[PDB]
Write a protein that binds this DNA or RNA. Structure first.
Lengths: 263, 255, 263, 258
DNA sequence: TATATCATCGATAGTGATATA
DNA sequence: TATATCACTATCGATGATATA
């Protein structure tokens, strides 16, 4: 049926329902006026004028501009192919746009695209208070270290982490431990000194220092001194991830590293 | 990224506004949570979820192993090209569909198919009528092409000449390179078709043989591809244009 | 009331309802957590987390990144103006963008804009049949002539237009009339020759010619010879508006003009 | 480039898709009938009518005197300028509305403000740095150390000078690219007067603001700065501040006097 | 009967409420 | 209590139907 003809035009030749029905009628009857198209098709009378005129622009029909516009269809063997030929031409240029767009994006993204692979955030600053939260974040730093692990503990750490440290040390992580001499007695049964005496890590001690810290690679962990709170194990501690800041702390640690007696 | 990266993705990669932003965010940080997204981007929190699964269903993001739940970006160099390929192939699938749809129509309209002036809109449709004039030619063919009137109809011209039709061809010098591999020149130097060329002429036309075809000139119309072209079937009119053709003909090189 | 404060923020500071209520709550209580904000405001519990984060980015609140995010408002005397200062920077560039866009449009549109203002549509081609339609279009040409009017009539014109011609001639339009001498007898008593004899226009005559035409400026009007139709006055005539085409017709008329007797 | 023109009209002139196309068509031919438009343009016939009166209601087109239902275009050089001006005036009309709304809020929030404990806060965006650095300058009493990159303490010269007048020792270190900004600035008047040391250096890794045991610094992540989400930290701690102060004093000795 | 307008659908994009553990 | 999704609105653009002299 003609339904098939109409259906084919809409899908592959960019003609709408009315425009489709129109062209089919044109080929069928040869020459038609807007008024005639309404009687020999299903196209609404009021639309027959802009529909045929629309076809006039797309190149499907020819016209006689007058009081009574006459329209005749172009040979379907002609229009149907030029459409494809043009359609192939429009797709080619549309392709060119996609490639140039790709190159630009790959150019703009080059500086932005980085091997950053979190490790959740995105967050370079974290506030920890609880004893539970203090330990969990402490383990993450050690169990994720890759280059160096620097520790300056004066008893602000809630729990001993010998195993968490050794777990990293055995992973090929260079480690430096600095402790207050009022902590050494607590390390007699702990077998970290073994790694120290065996030279698997460096362990020194100092009488006192007012800037405890835990440096793990680009991350650093310290507390906002409030001795009243530390006793209640609710002291506020801050985690910061930045090479500029850590680079600064590393200098202080090196400062503390000296003047320290080897255990 | 700014407007530009989000812009290109929307315009040339079928991504909506939110999706365009989200993808950018992923590329920047590598891994993002729906909440982390709303915070870092101008994508509403309530939309961050649906938008993210829309980015994986489109192939820009993929859920990282281990929920719940983080998303990673598909590296641009990969996802961008795969979109092009999958696009070209959908195009190739269409062009063939068109070529197949064309034949089905032509076979359906066969039964249906079986004066004195007609108008054609657009210089890109000129050949839709000039061809019928070349197939109906019997005695004489005079052509002064500007580059649009009879493009890619070289076969119908030679085909007409073989039918013993007197053929005179006048061209602009800028069209010479196009005829290099053309069989037309082979018919010109063989002396079965006259072919002269000149620099510029005001009125391009095609007369074959008692019919005339010419295009009007209105710069405003040419922007919209709505230039007016006229087909007139009249010996008195055609005779007039022929005087003009013979006029242009007098100042040309054999070439 | 708080309504006013909220109402004012939404309208002039680009904050939505929830974000507004949030900031108001922040200033009221000083420091709040997402959960707390739900109890002292109208912000939905589930939204309080992304809302505070939203204020955090716009610069309305400060935060303590942790398991329990603490948020504090920035002094409204600060943010409210800093917003304006930024708002003016964004409006300024948007202005420059609109202006830079303006110059570009005026360059691209310069060649397209022309003082051409047609009387009856942007149609340069008309097909006319019948005496009524033939005459109306003929008068339009005369009532629109400005430079020159060239006429070669052999009776294909449906009606005498002496007055329509004179109306134009008196308007300062140079006119040339060419007729078949088998029409002159139809001009006895006619007061057109007066303008001819008085030299207000040029009037000549010729034995015969097979290309009648009516040239009015850039327009030309002729018929596709069908003597059978001309008798029934239904011959098909064409109106064309183009200087290139008319320039050709003007030459043909000039050809007949010389070989024509001035009588 | 018709595509370009329609693009620009839509982007910078609040014109709809059809309206942008319609106007262009008008400019090309000068006068168009709704039917004549649909034929020559990509505007649907059923829309050409409403669209045209929408172009006049925006001031791009006007009904011909005929009228004969014909529309002519308002010359771009005119209609374009009229849009900007009427926009600027609508903008200036808004700026005052904002400035007026601002004061009304401050008087409404006056009763609320009675709170301005915690010693650490985070601020998102280098463009929001001053929202906190200001409070640090108002609370200054003894010492102020500033290493500005051009964002840490921008437009706070008034709050800075006010602090200096309160007898606070002030050292300001800047990048050479910031020197031109201080031209005719009263800072120099306080510099040449010798009540505040002002040195300059080429480049330093860690910009900061130290004022009375408080420190303000911004972290560095290029990805975040694109989104204006750079993380900035405020820390109130003598041990920490003392650390930053050591770094500042380091930069200070290598800086140029200016 | 030609000149004039409407109604439908799906896609966005903004913004204010609700749902599963 | 924190994660999770939804929902109502307007504007837009393409498409199929009516309206008024």
């Amino acid at each position: 049926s003609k339904d098939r003809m109409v259906e084919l035009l809409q899908e592959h030749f960019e003609l709408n329902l009315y425009e489709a029905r129109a062209y089919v009628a044109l080929v069928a009857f040869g020459v038609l006026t807007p008024a005639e198209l309404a009687s020999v098709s299903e196209v609404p009378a009021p639309r027959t004028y802009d529909v045929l005129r629309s076809l006039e622009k797309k190149g499907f029909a020819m016209t006689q501009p007058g009081k009574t516009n006459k329209y005749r269809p172009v040979h379907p063997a002609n229009v149907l192919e030029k459409f494809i030929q043009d359609w192939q031409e429009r797709v080619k240029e549309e392709l060119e746009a996609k490639k140039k767009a790709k190159e630009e994006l790959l150019e703009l993204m080059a500086p932005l695209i980085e091997t950053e692979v979190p490790k959740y955030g995105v967050e370079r600053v974290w506030v920890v208070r609880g004893i539970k939260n203090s330990t969990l974040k402490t383990k993450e730093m050690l169990e994720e270290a890759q280059n160096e692990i620097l520790l300056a503990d004066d008893g602000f750490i809630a729990v001993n982490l010998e195993d968490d440290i050794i777990k990293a040390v055995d992973r090929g992580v260079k480690t430096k431990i600095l402790l207050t001499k009022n902590l050494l007695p607590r390390l007699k049964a702990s077998k970290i000194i073994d790694y120290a005496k065996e030279g698997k890590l460096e362990l020194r001690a100092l009488d006192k220092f007012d800037l405890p810290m835990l440096i793990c690679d680009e991350e650093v962990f310290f507390a906002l001194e409030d001795l009243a709170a530390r006793y209640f194990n609710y002291e506020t501690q801050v985690w910061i991830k930045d090479h500029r800041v850590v680079a600064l702390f590393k200098e202080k640690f090196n400062e503390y590293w000296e003047k320290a007696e080897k255990v």
